[PDB]
Amino acid sequence: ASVTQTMKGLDIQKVAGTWYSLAMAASDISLLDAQSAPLRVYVEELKPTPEGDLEILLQKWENGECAQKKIIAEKTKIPAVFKIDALNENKVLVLDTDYKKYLLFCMENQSLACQCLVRTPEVDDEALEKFDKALKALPMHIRLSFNPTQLEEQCHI
Amino acid sequence: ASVTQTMKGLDIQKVAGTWYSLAMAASDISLLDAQSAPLRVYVEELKPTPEGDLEILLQKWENGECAQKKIIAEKTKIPAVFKIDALNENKVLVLDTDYKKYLLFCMENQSLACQCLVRTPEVDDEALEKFDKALKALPMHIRLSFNPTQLEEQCHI
Ligand SMILES: CCCCCCCCCCCCCC(=O)O
Ligand SMILES: CCCCCCCCCCCCCC(=O)O
């Protein structure tokens, strides 16, 4: 269940800028089933702070409407692991990224969701291979992927 | 998009009896998202009629409740292809089965959903491999799998 793959030698400054949530998977179906499931979040932009923390802009459907949400991930001892304040303190692990095209990540509390991010609104078969193979290891029960048209809309409608 | 894998030399009498919908995937996320999505159907039992048609018992969530539904699939020229009466006349294709453990199928109208069925409430990694690899070919955007506990409940709650 635990995630035991992280990016060796991650430079968090190089993941700054725009991303698309091409695909997402989670351990429990109810975390992603509906448009307003808890972890159905669409990534807009990564903004690393100078002090090394990560700021995230994303979209989340709630109250029948697509909201913008800004969120702050705090660094830890490990460069590929970050921390998000909540009801219960969640972890974000960076699995892999080539900076220029794709980045794979997971978040944990036991529950768990992961995502394949890409720089452009295109179906990258390669990044998807890598995403599937990192997931093989994990106990997933729901997976979503989206098309180029959907990737350009708010909340992937 | 089209399904171009079918079981060679299918004997429809040998798939009679009990099955579990271990996993399901579809081309559009809305066909499977909610408990009452159109193609979120859980297979209970296969009953082949003497004249070669297939009778299916299944469970479908609707009106906030888990209903039993009986359904009838009519044979065609091809042993692995069957036909279900509806608003629009749908096809059911049998991709693969070893009769004793697993059976993979898809249904078509363009929309498309497939399933990995198994005889017992157990996670069969093998049948899942075969399911993933038959799906590789197809344009899927939502996938669900269920655990042994869920497999014994009505509507996989
Ligand atoms: C390094 C890139 C990681 C991107 C992580 C995105 C953060 C997702 C947190 C999801 C928690 C729900 C958001 C909320 O509504 O508060
Ligand atoms: C050979 C085994 C094939 C099993 C096929 C199951 C039939 C699924 C039909 C789904 C259509 C919706 C059912 C309904 O509510 O009318």
Residue numbers in the entry:
A (entry chain A), B (entry chain A): 1 to 109, 115 to 162
Published text:
Bovine β-lactoglobulin (BlgB) is a small protein (18.3 kDa) belonging to the lipocalin family. Due to BlgB ability to bind different classes of bioactive compounds, its application as a nutrients nanotransporter or drug carrier is currently an object of intensive studies. As other proteins from lipocalin family, BlgB can be re-engineered to gain specificity of binding selected bioactive ligands, and this requires heterologous protein production in the appropriate expression system. Detailed studies, presented below, revealed the presence of uncleaved N-terminal methionine and endogenous fatty acid tightly bound in the binding pocket which significantly influenced properties of the recombinant protein and affected binding of pharmaceutical agents.
To eliminate N-terminal Met, we have engineered two mutations (L1A/I2S), which were designed according to more recent findings by Frottin et al.. The new lactoglobulin variant carrying substitutions L1A/I2S at N-terminus (sBlgB) has been produced and purified by two different protocols. The sBlgB purified by protocol #1, based on the method proposed by Ponniah et al., had spectroscopic properties corresponding very well to milk protein and crystallised in the conditions typical for natural protein. The crystal structure was in agreement with MS results, indicating that N-terminal methionine has been successfully cleaved (determined m.w. was 18,211.7 ± 5 Da, while the calculated was 18,213.05 Da). Electron density maps confirmed that disulphide bridges, between residues Cys66–Cys160 and Cys106–Cys119, are correctly formed, so the applied system of BlgB co-expression with DsbC works efficiently for lactoglobulin sequence carrying mutation L1A/I2S. Similarly to previous structure, electron density maps revealed the presence of a ligand in the β-barrel, even though no ligand was added to protein solution and crystallization drops. The electron density in the binding pocket was similar to that observed in the structures of lactoglobulin–fatty acid complexes, and it has been interpreted as a myristic acid. However, ITC tests were constantly showing a very low stoichiometry of SDS binding, with the values similar to the observed for rBlgB. These results indicated that the binding site of sBlgB#1 was probably occupied by endogenous ligand.
